[model samples]
Target: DVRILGYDPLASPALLQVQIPATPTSLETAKRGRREAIDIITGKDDRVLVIVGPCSIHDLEAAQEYALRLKKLSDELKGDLSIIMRAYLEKPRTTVGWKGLINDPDVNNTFNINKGLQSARQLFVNLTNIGLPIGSEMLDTISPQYLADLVSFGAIGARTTESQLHRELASGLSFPVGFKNGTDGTLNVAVDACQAAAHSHHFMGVTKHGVAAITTTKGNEHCFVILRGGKKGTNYDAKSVAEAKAQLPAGSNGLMIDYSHGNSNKDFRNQPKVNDVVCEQIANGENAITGVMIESNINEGNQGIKYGVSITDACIGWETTEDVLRKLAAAVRQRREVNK
Candidate 1:
């Protein structure tokens, strides 16, 4: 049973008509973030990667509440960690599911991108004003044009790690980028992504005025790999980390361990345990592990996205997240003393 309706590409020019703020300060800040990330990734800085937030933003009020709490956590752990809010707006679906805030913002597919863009920008501006650097998975290639200035870090997800378009985008990205291995648990693809992104590439992308242009990039050296486990299993153990590091060239940077995903075997309860293991390793003077990513929110576990429901991935809640962060910070402090 298929239904068809007449379509018009020009039916709504306004749909794609949100004006971008070409602020110099915003661009300057983004450029500086690249240097900071490169320094941290190469062991020049000892700050941990505290990329924390809900899997997706469903409710603005709830997201703000979580951000407020995280702001406090950031202040408390500022000495040992670099906190970034995972303000994901677009979702890359495994099959066909909720497409994130930009599309189906109301979960009804009204396709109100004008409203979606405003919401996305407002959240980024609000969170940045709260004194938090933001991170997002670069799912939509053209999205950065609207929000890149407000973000300090970007990630190429497991599903898109092997895509050449994504690699090209990463090369031109102003912030430090991370590439995760495939969902099926392969690190070669991610390694290839990093290698490809470290060099200049010319690609087609949208201009700031929303026009198509052939863009040239100077390549980004601030990129690294993230081990998010895989379809077969987790890849955060010491041996896997060592093997992945070995794959890189001499003087190549390290990888960030995602304690969730396959590392948790889909069990949200195991997130804390995985973090504890990495923390213990850090305390043992193993500096190969450079950062950590946690899927956390105002609530624990996950709820179904029943057409209009919320959350596409399971996330650990606030109380548990706070406890885990404190312990991890303690581990970092202990490691600092040990190294001294």
Candidate 2:
């Protein structure tokens, strides 16, 4: 029975109303977090931006539990880091599998997108209400129309760094965007994406009313590069960062580093090691390293899709996440003293 379900079938009006309506407080929180992140990226703030949370959010209960704890930690380390929970709802697949919560909230192949969208929006609103800003990989260009307003930080994953559509989408995003280097570990593509996203673009898209229309962007100046290594190997070192900076335009001096993926050789356990090296660099006056990303959850490691846990990448547990963050905060403190 392969067939088209329908066109523009799901309107967000009812979903937004029932799930999580945007309020003044939620909007302000997103704005404040976005401003702070931009400050960090542009060198206006000395603190490092830490985008931490699960690799993929499948369990809403676990996500909320994790967010509560992270909010408390973020407040305590506000002086040294800007922490945003990774409320990633959509995941891009290399081949085939469970995409993410927004695509399959039930994890039973039901594909109830309307329900998934509602849940994702509710989670974003809930997290922001509790004082923790949200971050997500903008996998689907259309989905942002539903959830981007609630997000303070957004990323274009490695697989899409060179995609024209994604670059166009990033150009219109209100919050700061990070374009990860190609999965093969080269910075040229991501650097190019940053340059492209900084300029105006015209493309086809859907409006808030779910109407198809031509979209025009004024260009986003808050876009930057994120090095997540590649098949060539780890690129979070000072040398690779310098190489990446050389490729980027002026004012785009700093870059974010992902401690997972190719940088960690695709092993979750290696994230802490990669993080340690990054922290040492930051402490030793490496100003170009603006932020670091880690995949962490309430539980360590990953499980099967049926296990109701991460069906994608494994993540470091909460205990390890806290320890690594504390160490990073201490390193930033040292860096601040040196600057003073």
Candidate 3:
């Protein structure tokens, strides 16, 4: 009794399924969005795929509001950019802290994982219903079964790029996935992961019915890399971008840049500078830079673990986010003009 203090049964994916299900229209929208994103990533589409939004979601209302604004901006910039809202629910930690919405939706350390799962799925469905494609970092391998269908894009964070489990999970993801370079600034691991994820894999996984089963994946060919910088230095520079591109295998298309983390020296304010450099690179016809990621929320910076605010990383404000996106759109148009 002391060692095992009674087990609490959480709802299975099937049970959670009935509570929050994706509409047919939303499913189609998510699929189409993923297709467009893949086209952009594989160089079939020239538009830059911008994954922009909060670093983490603590306030559902604020996130929904941001999504509405983003949806409007996405429509306006459809010609030059394919914008996917970053509705990340899982947060990977270095030591230990609040995981994310899917870990502690209450933000009070309740660790009500079942509630978190329900909330995360509902939010994804709601955002997809709003006609905006969703992106999330897949941290927990088992968590994807409940929400992956509603997500148009997925990311494997820097800390887990080399994890065999994550690579295996990426192999099965339906949408295009991006694997970030290791936190120590290595790219080979991520490149290797991309190559690995593009092959078929059989792994132990849970079925939609919450049963343990052998999951065989046909492999996902739309895997790419993300350069979020590392302990060494920023890799968003033209030379670094080119070098990273050269390292990737043929048909990998291009890589994404994260403007907030090491690329910005871990400062939210430095994000714009990073963003400017990426746009400048694009303007100069750097096609290897497929996209850029920015962590922006309704408000600027971060707060302690509380309700309705980021408990992890700080972020750029909404006003600054809109400005940066608009400028990027203009830069894309400029690049088009130069190419023409």
The best candidate in terms of TM-score: 3
Which residue pairs does candidate 3 place in steric collision? none
Candidate 3 structure quality by residue, lDDT tens digits, 1-340: 7899677677888778778989887798799889999998988888899999988887788889889998998998899889999999999888988889989999888889999999998899989998999899999988988998899999999999999999999999999999999898878999999999999999999998988899999888988889999987889988888789778777685789989888888788999998888899888887778888999887788887343356578888888988998888888888877778
User: What lDDT would each prediction earn against the true structure?
Assistant: 0.79, 0.88, 0.88
Q: What is the lDDT of residue 70 in candidate 1?
A: 93
- The alpha-carbon root-mean-square deviation between model 2 and the true structure, to one decimal in Å, is 1.9
- The reply for model 1, stretches above 4 Å from the true place, is 1-36, 306-310
* Candidate 1, run of 10 with poorest lDDT: 8-17
Candidate 2 error regions (>4 Å)? 1-8, 13-19, 306-309
In model 3, what is the error at residue 31, expressed in angstroms?
1.0
RMSD (Cα, Å) for all candidates, in order, is 3.5, 1.9, 1.6
Each prediction's TM-score against the native?
0.90, 0.95, 0.96
lDDT score, candidate 1, position 49: 72
lDDT of 1: 0.79
Model 1: per-residue lDDT, tens digit, 1-340?
A: 2576654232122233334342455445445445556667888887677778877887777777788899899889878877778888988887888878866678676866667777777777667666667788998898787787778999999999999999999999888888998998878898899889999999888887666889999997778889999886788877777788778775567688888877889788899999888888787777767788999988787887421123777888788999999988888888888889
The TM-score, computed over Cα atoms with residue i paired to residue i, of candidate 1 is: 0.90
